[PDB]
Amino acid sequence: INITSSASQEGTRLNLICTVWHKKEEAEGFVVFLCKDRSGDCSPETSLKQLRLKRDISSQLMFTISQVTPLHSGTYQCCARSQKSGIRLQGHFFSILFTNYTVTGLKSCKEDEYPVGSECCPKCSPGYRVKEACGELTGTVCEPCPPGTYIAHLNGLSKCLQCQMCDPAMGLRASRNCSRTENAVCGCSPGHFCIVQDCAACR
């Protein structure tokens, strides 16, 4: 499994290409999607284009721009995700720079990149740890956070953070549940009021 981004100019047309290799019996459920100028919340719902497949080994999304304009100026990302597996792929960022234009980042770090040896890798989405770091040509692999853990922010973390448990013994209970992207909150039990803050315990 991997993901790569590239581009082809043919005529005045410019083609942006997201290419993903995935195991064949992963194909059913699979989405690949290109977003422009996200804040690390590439989702299908927010993508310029998307492609969804069902089979029952490579998949490629192309996004064609007939003529390049300052409207096309920006940073793009190719992303993909498996619906059965939950696994998500984060392509390398690349930006169209209109000036006549140039495309960059095809092939220190950016906001939404983290550092890894001699490269800068795409961060994983909220609610996802880094399964596998990016290589030169290939982007980052992300796995969803397992139940009991979370990460709220775009990240390059290899373990998810442990959601805080609340001690029933202290008149604490979860006022907000633990989801993959949100930590739990401890509030007070029925008819209890808080006395130590952080609540650490209730009366």
Ligand X SMILES: *[C@@H]1O[C@H](CO)[C@@H](O[C@@H]2O[C@H](CO)[C@@H](O[C@@H]3O[C@H](CO)[C@@H](O)[C@H](O[C@@H]4O[C@H](CO)[C@@H](O)[C@H](O)[C@@H]4O)[C@@H]3O)[C@H](O)[C@H]2NC(C)=O)[C@H](O)[C@H]1NC(C)=O
Ligand Y SMILES: *[C@@H]1O[C@H](CO)[C@@H](O[C@@H]2O[C@H](CO)[C@@H](O)[C@H](O)[C@H]2NC(C)=O)[C@H](O)[C@H]1NC(C)=O
Binding-site ranges for ligand X (CB under 6 A): 2, 4, 21, 57, 137-138
Q: 19 by DSSP, 3-state: which?
A: strand
User: Of ligand X, ligand Y, none, which one does residue 185 interact with (CB within 5 to 8 Å by kind)?
Assistant: none
C-beta nearest to ligand Y: residue: 177
User: Of ligand X, ligand Y, none, which one does residue 137 interact with (CB within 5 to 8 Å by kind)?
Assistant: ligand X
User: Of ligand X, ligand Y, none, which one does residue 174 interact with (CB within 5 to 8 Å by kind)?
Assistant: ligand Y
Residue 7 or residue 174: which is nearer to ligand Y going by CB?
174
Angle at 180 between CA 174 and CA 183, to 5 degrees: 35
CA gap 38, 122 in Å, rounded: 13
Residue 178 Cβ, how far from ligand Y at the closest point, in Å? 8
Residue 174 Cβ, how far from ligand Y at the closest point, in Å? 6
Per-residue b/e over 129-158, b at no fewer than 16 CB within 10 Å? bbbbbbeeebbbbbbbbeeebbbeebbbbe
| Residue 127 CA neighbour count, 13 Å, CB half | 10
User: Of ligand X, ligand Y, none, which one does residue 21 interact with (CB within 5 to 8 Å by kind)?
Assistant: ligand X
Footprint of ligand Y (CB under 6 A): 174, 176-177
Residue 51 or residue 163: which is nearer to ligand X going by CB?
51
Residue 66 or residue 169: which is nearer to ligand Y going by CB?
169
- After what residue numbers is the chain broken, C–N > 2.5 angstroms? 56, 99, 107, 198
Q: What contacts 81, CB < 8 A, 6 or more positions away? A: 30, 31, 87, 88, 89
Residue 49 Cβ, how far from ligand X at the closest point, in Å? 22
Residue 45 Cβ, how far from ligand Y at the closest point, in Å? 24
Residue 21 or residue 101: which is nearer to ligand X going by CB?
21
Residue 89 or residue 184: which is nearer to ligand Y going by CB?
184
